[PDB]
Homo-oligomer: A and B are copies of this chain.
Amino acid sequence: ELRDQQEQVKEDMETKCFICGIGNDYFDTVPHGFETHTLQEHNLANYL
């Protein structure tokens, strides 16, 4: 159960943006779009 919890956390974190909650594919229509969105546009560190 602990391993599954860790895996679920990482999968959610890598599949959907933390703030908006939009799936990764929509952003990934542009190459590297998901990482661009989650690291430049919607960044929790930036909100902090």
Contacts and interface: CB of A to CB of B under 8 A. Distances in A.
Interface of A: 1, 3, 21, 28
Contacts of A3: 1
Nearest to A28: B21
Contacts of A1: 3
A17 to B, nearest CB: 13
Contacts of A21: 28
2 contacts: A1-B3, A21-B28
Contacts of A28: 21
A20 to B, nearest CB: 10
A3 to B, nearest CB: 7
